[PDB]
Amino acid sequence: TSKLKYVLQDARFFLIKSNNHENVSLAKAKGVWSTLPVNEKKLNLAFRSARSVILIFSVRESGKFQGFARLSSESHHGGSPIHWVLPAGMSAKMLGGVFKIDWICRRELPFTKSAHLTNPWNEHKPVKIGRDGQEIELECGTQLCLLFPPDESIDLYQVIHKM
Numbered sequence: 001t002s003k004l005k006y007v008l009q010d011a012r013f014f015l016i017k018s019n020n021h022e023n024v025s026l027a028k029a030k031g032v033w034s035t036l037p038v039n040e041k042k043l044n045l046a047f048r049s050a051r052s053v054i055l056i057f058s059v060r061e062s063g064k065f066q067g068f069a070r071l072s073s074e075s076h077h078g079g080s081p082i083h084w085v086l087p088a089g090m091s092a093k094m095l096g097g098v099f100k101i102d103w104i105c106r107r108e109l110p111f112t113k114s115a116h117l118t119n120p121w122n123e124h125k126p127v128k129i130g131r132d133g134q135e136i137e138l139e140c141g142t143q144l145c146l147l148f149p150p151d152e153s154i155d156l157y158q159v160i161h162k163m
């Protein structure tokens with residue numbers, strides 16, 4: 001876990017809520033994510049400001065987090081359309097900005113294991129609670145990531161080089 005801690009050193013953390021499992025599975029396979037423009041702008045700002053920006057994913061109604069990943073780029077808009085399963089009210093143009101991500105952990109964590117972690121940037125509510133795009137304060141974000149089971153399929157050596 002030493003390289004993982006190095007990656008998380010001085011990182012920023014954002015909670016990502018997905019309305020469906022399909023888009024998270026697509027993101028795990030293709031190494032990309034898209035979000036609404038309001039969160040798009042926040043992530044682009046954070047990417048320039050921090051050694052690592054970490055997205056922590058939770059599919060709505062799953063009672064779990066599905067893993068976490070590190071931004072490797074700002075968003076980009078002209079490309080082969082990612083076949084997101086679009087939520088009601090969410091257009092393809094809204095999700096047009098595509099971030100490239102490197103997965104750090106593709107394993108699940110149930111909300112029952114994070115009940116002791118609260119987020120100061122969301123009124124000290126349990127970290128599972130938050131809107132899509134909610135920033136998670138450093139210490140709580142770091143501890144949440146360290147709770148996930150190790151993903152032995154990942155080699156963080158390549159991630160460290162991009163820092």
Ligand SMILES: CNc1ncnc2c(C)n[nH]c12
Pocket residue numbers: 017018019020023033034035036084085087095132
């Ligand atoms: C690909 N991005 C997304 N897919 C499905 N749902 C959501 C939400 C609530 N934010 N971003 C989403």
